[PDB]
């Protein structure tokens, strides 16, 4: 389900700005922290007061020297000054000047605006001439709670309405009690409107309540006393709560097949209690009359057990499409029914179980998938016929590849989301060798996001090379976990564990410099990697950090 | 199935430094092999007692110069030197000295490690103050046994339950010996961790086999004497051993139906020997009374063979949504049954049999995709109404094209792979090439490499014009089978059979160069290509190995 | 149905070789029409005897006067020159010379090859110390008439064997000659081997009819005189003859549905004469007893036109899974039938008609995705609220591209095609231009494949405008079809019809120029299209071109 994000702590500012502008003042704001009380805001009708726009106007002074002139008094404009310090309301007279050089007498509402702390923020300049969440693991665990009750009303209202301290009754009163909670739930609980990305409180919510889904749910828990027992079918409107809540009931995969497969239950359990219904409601030959024929109950007559089972076993295969002819339709009434039926069901066959074939597909998708793009590989093999020592690395890389990725494509994913995501994500990517390494420490905000950008991650499983000698050594690696060794004609000379770094200094050669030798990984070792151009280009951008980058940095083995 | 790649040999060195990860010692590593005994290790505790870093201490010669003082002997130095040769433990005292300046009292505990061949391989510095394996062929046919078998205790344990020297008995006894056998056969036979890609030995097998599929496996092989016929029940649980070895089961597109097609039949005969049992165990009007008026055997009562037939005739018509009529269920447990066999037979039949319709076109995907291909072509014919003489080469290279790659993308393959991998599946793709001519073996693996990646394959069948008169000649290409022929106005100049070379030097000109005449292919000629553009930039980064080409390497067909 | 290229007129040079390979000869093979007989082949035999290697061998006189030296007479060589000229066989003796020093003795043996025509050709240099074609129109349209035939035989043969001057017996004869002429024709028609592109004459197709598809066609077409009625079930074999043929049946789309759908035919008649068959043959109850108390004629019998039907009528219920209960399997013989039915047609039923649901989406797959793709276009319209002038704009232009393109990526196509091809189908796109204008036609085929490549074709309905006024002038445009307007503030300044070309010259100002106004097309005008970065880049490669191009090009309208 989805819940908006808070309203930011100066979203204050938006609503003075909102309400003033119904009014259509002409005023400034300017901040109190900030040293000199800069201006920040300057709406369209003090531009045409004054004449200056809003690139002179912000990040200026708000005792504002250029709007003084000749005419202005040294004591006026110092009750101006004071009254910042001072914190209260004085409407201070005094003649400002405009651009052009005419002249006019204004009064300046100095309304200082104040939190719950106790302490000036803002200066506003006006001129004239018992609480529950909806995202709450309270709430989320008590939906599948009401689903469950809900299902109670949908099987047990139908079979007490069309077939007629006992332990039955006692039951039903209890979930007539649920929904009459359920009412008193939703006034207190949040909601999730279109613009306000959260909204709380009783004033607001209420509003909502009403003039939506309160009108149905409030049919629901309106039990009488006053046979009369149609007036009970009224509960069936208590389904309509799962409707409006699906959101909820679609996270899991494997809960919506047992949505799909309980409601085509039913959906078979209302029309045989309306099959049912056809039997008694025309009773002058008909099915009820056959049935008793093959149990041997004619007239007494047969039980309840059997009129519903045969009814629901009726239901069931006309809608499923097998059609036994134990029981079949032979009055005229009975026959539309099973017409009915039939085009229903052959609707509902069809459109119901499409959609559990899709999501035995959609819950099972990383094994089908597998077996297409494993046959790739298989006809790849095959196509350019792959020896043995080759062969077990493509087997072997592939099932390693997609067991760790779940096979699923990084890169496509991260292009959806903007740059400011993305660099927060690859932040969280490589967290490892920001925070704990020597050199990043000593950067600031903007040089740790571009770094992350164009850094990558590389898993190494055991006995892969990735450099050889004699190689253009491109990349720049970082190791996390694991432990990685160098080699040179089968002769262990490095083994580099975590937190270590090996590739060549950039600022000595300014060439791509050949290696030394092989490189080796033992362990499933984690390790992540960079560019020459992609490095580089980043060092330019910001040269103070260059110095400290180069300096600071150690690498564990230089290649040549 | 998956097998993961042997541990390396130089695992070992893995192992000492976790378990001395674990005592929280402070050591280094050096290697025997080398000339000066290098270290290749050292963990963050030696540079804490030090003080100095990796970069500095890594390629140095063990004794270490730079940690002796004034304070320590000429004779105690001595005693380090004679002890790396002599190989044995020798716990010499000395005084170290740090980087800043203070000296400290220190340990030497040497302790050389050794293989089974009996020669020095490593110096070690303490400081302190009857086998089976998974993937042969011996147990893969013998999992498609197993399998044989397990049908046979689906099918005959129920018919045996449930209607009920012997020939049937003796045949049974033969199968409980057989997953007897079973258990023995997976105490020695391998596994894959999901850490350790291969493990072996009875030590660390029987650990995993118990707390996992052995406490279901163990029910399964235990027969007992002591009616009490429900007890033969249990062998249903050797099906679990199909479930557990899914992996190797999925391999082949076609077995694949089979499992699927195999287990509707186990599906349906299970269900009828279940809908027996309803007939029987309730006998005070039911369906087995019914079928003794249908055939005439009224009460003696009628034959097994009939008994077992009629109800898998019935559980088959009403899972396949037939509904024949001739059976069918009147008792309110028989209609009961037939409900729970409609609901789990629109899931079977829509799951089942959607996987079915699937995997036959994905067993026919070629010719699926072939037709749809085909489409776009013969689309694109009749929209530009193109003529014969050309109509027969899109044809006719199409249909060459798409029989030799079979329908697959070749590059979209290789784009999943990292670099390390595509220069080794196209080291192996221009084998012809790399070994057999004279330029490219006086070069270093890393040239290999780096040329392989850059190189094409470019299949010519009969009677195509690779390049034309006065064409860029971009390309320069290599020829492995085949023969080529090079004309000018229809004259046969060239005849350009295997291990032939044509184009341009690159030297001589230094610019895109026109070519002489036309060039045709006579036979299914196998060729490989490049470019200057991707050449030139290859033999920038290797200088001597430019030198060594452009010498060596003598083109047949110059161009101009 | 594919069929291959046929043989170049210069393969018979292959096969010459291929010979000679065989012997292990050292030869070479010189031209005649060309001016002083170039070599054009040299095998590795060749180069191990002289030293030489083929660069510089190839493309020097076959005379070798490098081969001669100090040991050679004038005499000798006298009569290998005259040899040439003469034209026939003569093994002239004398003494070469390799390239290190050492001399050897040779005897010369110049073949001339020569044509049907009377004319030498070659020059080989010998050293030692009634008939059909596949794909005609004829055969084409016999395949179906075949295929008619043989559904003839699919469902005649059966009826006759099962329910068993005549009109029946005459028209059944008439088939078994057509098969047995069927057999004659396929030792005189073509096909196409893997290797050999086309191969005819009856020396050559014998070998690959006899051990193939014969020995099956072999048994259809021998009929006996010799009840024994059951021989007849041999002439099912026919049926095999589309199967090895299903290429040319699979070609269009409609005719695809009637395959599949007259076999659901024939596999419930063969399932009907099947399931007559197990009624007669047990006859001590049955299905055929049970017939004759439902319609009056119980036991004479009841009448074959019945017998027939109410067979059919049944196992299309079956194998349809409606199951209608008129009939229904009693006995155990039935019973089993029936499951056989029920199982394979739920494998049939899931497999044909799922066949069958796709081929009628890929039959209307330009419907399909047309309605899919412009749902996109309603949504991207909703989503910005496009107002009308530039509704109307995208919905015409949508429709027209499409009806114009029948949903179909043009460039997607090429791509699969390599550069020889492509710059040929462009070729013909641009056949307009390039043979009919004036400046192209003074050109080089590398130069008009050249440019084909980086031409477009841009459709422009009436009322598009293609250019505005002070916009970069990227293109220079051609028009073939329909009639430009060119315009500057609603003044209707030109009139470009067919053959006329706009834009602006390259030659004077090297810089992008601006337009002069706008240009709007009237009628569908077919135009086509350049840019300044492609076509500048085409004249730097072709000097000699680029002087005869501006000078002879003449642009209607200069645009500044």
Redesign the interface.
Known sequence: VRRGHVAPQNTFLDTIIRKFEGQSRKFIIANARVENCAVIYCNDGFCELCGYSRAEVMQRPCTCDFLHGPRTQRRAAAQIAQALLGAEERKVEIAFYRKDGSCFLCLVDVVPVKNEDGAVIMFILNFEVWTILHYSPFKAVWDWLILLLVIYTAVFTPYSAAFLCQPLAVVDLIVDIMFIVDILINFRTTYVNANEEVVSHPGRIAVHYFKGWFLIDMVAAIPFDLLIGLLKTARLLRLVRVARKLDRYSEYGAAVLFLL?CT??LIAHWLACIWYAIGNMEQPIGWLHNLGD???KPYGGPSI??KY??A??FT??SL???????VSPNTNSEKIFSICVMLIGSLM?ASI?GN??AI??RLYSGTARY??QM???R??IR??Q??NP?R????????H?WSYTNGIDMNAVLKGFPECLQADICLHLNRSLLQHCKPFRGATKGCLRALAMKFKT?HA??????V?????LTALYFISRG?I?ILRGD?????L?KN?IFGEPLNLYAR?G??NGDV?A???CDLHKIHRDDLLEVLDMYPEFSDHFWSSL????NLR
Chains 1, 2, 3 share one sequence.
């Open positions: 497969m085509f239950a093959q149990i041997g057990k059997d089972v045969t629901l076993y069931f295969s499923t499409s097998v059609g036994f002819g134990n066959y179980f559990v074939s035995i597909q077996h297409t046959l790739r590989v006809e790849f196509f350019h792959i020896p080759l077990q690395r493509l087997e072997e890389y592939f099932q590849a590389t499983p055991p006995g892969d090379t990735l050889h000698a004699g190689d253009l432990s060794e002769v262990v000379v490095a083994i564990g270590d791509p050949k290696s080796r033992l362990t499933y150690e690498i564990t083995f």
